[PDB]
Structure formats: C-alpha cells, structure tokens
UniProtKB/Swiss-Prot annotation:
Transmembrane segment boundaries: 14-34, 79-99, 159-179, 211-231
Protein location: Cell membrane; Cell junction, Gap junction; Endoplasmic reticulum membrane
Gene giving rise to this polypeptide: PANX3
Organism for this UniProt entry: Homo sapiens (Human)
Membrane topology: Multi-pass membrane protein
Summary of the function given for this chain in its UniProt record: Regulator of osteoblast differentiation by functionning as a Ca(2+) channel in the endoplasmic reticulum which regulates calmodulin (CaM) pathways. Allows ATP release into the extracellular space and activation or purinergic receptors.
Residues bearing glycans: 45
Protein name (database record): Pannexin-3
Lineage: Eukaryota, Metazoa, Chordata, Craniata, Vertebrata
PROSITE patterns from the UniProt entry: PANNEXIN (PS51013)
One GO location term (cellular component): endoplasmic reticulum membrane
Record-level GO BP terms: cell-cell signaling; monoatomic cation transport; osteoblast differentiation; positive regulation of interleukin-1 production
Amino acid sequence: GLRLELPLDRIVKFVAVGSPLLLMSLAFAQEFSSGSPISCFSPSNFSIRQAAYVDSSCWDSLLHHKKSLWPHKALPYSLLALALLMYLPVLLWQYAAVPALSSDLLFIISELDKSYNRSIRLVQHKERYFEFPLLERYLACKQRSHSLVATYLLRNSLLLIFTSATYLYLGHFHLDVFFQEEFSCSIKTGLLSDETHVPNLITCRLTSLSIFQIVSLSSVAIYTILVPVIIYNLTRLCRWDKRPAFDLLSRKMLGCPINDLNVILLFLRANISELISFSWLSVDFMTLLAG
C-alpha cells in the first residue's frame, strides 16, 4: 500500500492528460450533430446533388483564393496528439524510475523501523553511532550516484518543452485565422473548367468558428495555469530538505543537493504515515518519548 507519486504530480498529470481529450470530445460531438461543418451559398439552379458536391469539394480543398485554412480540418487530430505527448512522460516515469525506488523505499523503511525498535530499549534507561553500519554505507553509496534524479528532472523538463511547443504551434498557426468565418472557394480549377454553368467563385462559411475560438482560448489558459506548478515541482528539490537514526540522517545532510538522496528523502517525507509517526505529530524529551 505504498504511495509512489507526489500528490501534486498526480493532479498535474490528470489535468494535462484529461483536458485535451475533453476539448477533442467537445469538438467531435458538435460537428456530428450540426451535420456539415461548412456551408456554401450555391446558385439557385444547382439542383440538390451539385450543391452537395460543391460543399464536399470546398471542405476538402479549404483554400481561400482572394490564404490557407487547414487548422480547421486538423483540430481534433492535433488535439489527440497532445494527449499522447502528455502521456509519454508518465510512461517514462512508470517504466524507468519506480521499480528501483520502490525497493529503495521498502528497504529503508524496514531498517528505519528496526533501528527505532532497537533504540526503544535504549530509551527506557556510546554503542549507537556504529550500531547501524548499513544506514551509513548504503546511504553513502546512494548519495554518490546520479541514477534516477536525472529521470525526475527530465520528466518535468519534457512537460515544459511540450508546453512550449504547444504555445508555439497555437500562436503561429491559430492566430492568423481568427475572425475569419467565410472565404471564396473555387472548384473551376481542374477538369471542371471550360464549363459555363458553374460560377467562377462560390462563397462559403465556416459553421464552427465558435468551437475553434473556445478551444484555442481554453487550452491556452489552462496550459498557462499549469506552468507555475510544474516549475515549483522542478525547483522543490533545489533547496535542501529539512524537517538517533534521524541524527545520522542529518549527519550527512550537506553538500550539493543534486543526488539520489534528495528524491528518496522527499518520498520518505511524503510517506511518513507508513511508519510510527506518533512522535512526529507532537513537534524531558526522553520522558515524553517514554510513552
């Protein structure tokens, strides 16, 4: 029943994955309802099937003559790609960091409990500093590594990079097609030319500009909101974490803070409820700890 993810990262992943899916569903469920996502004012003597042909041709082309409006067609697929892009760092953390850290937390929790139990017999009263050789050798070995701190940094770095990519994509493509609801589509380009019945230019109107605007604005707003929490999570480990065995923990509590020790200390602090935290909530001393 161990908890292997910080509470903030859980809600960050949930929001970042869920929101593009919700926006994509809000766009799929409207164009199926309204029918065609584009209308065209065909001439009066175009019967019925020719009007449908004009509609389909202008929707397929999507090129304003008098310049290109391709983002309208590729909205839900581009939104769906964002879901996979957000889900990739979660998969990386799931399949690259949690197996080692799970064992590293279980072992340290068990031996911390054992050390507390051993110190209990000393409480009811110095062969204590050397009494835990494992807690010094193992912790010195892990402090010199750089194994999974890199993955923890790189997950948030990837999330920030993809957020920046979304910013660039939106601000470079969707901005130039705002407030553009109609365009002059043409079909007299290929073999249909040299045929006098069809007019030269046909006006057509997009029927889903509101969905486009709402999706763009909402996505920009939420991915703006989601940046400070990400940078806070990234910068959380930069400052040194401070709250018998805890004395030995504080003994090697110094130096550059970029190790594997900081992440396991953070996960230990976030999982303090597993071990006996009776004395943790009450922040002489031996008399109080006697009970």
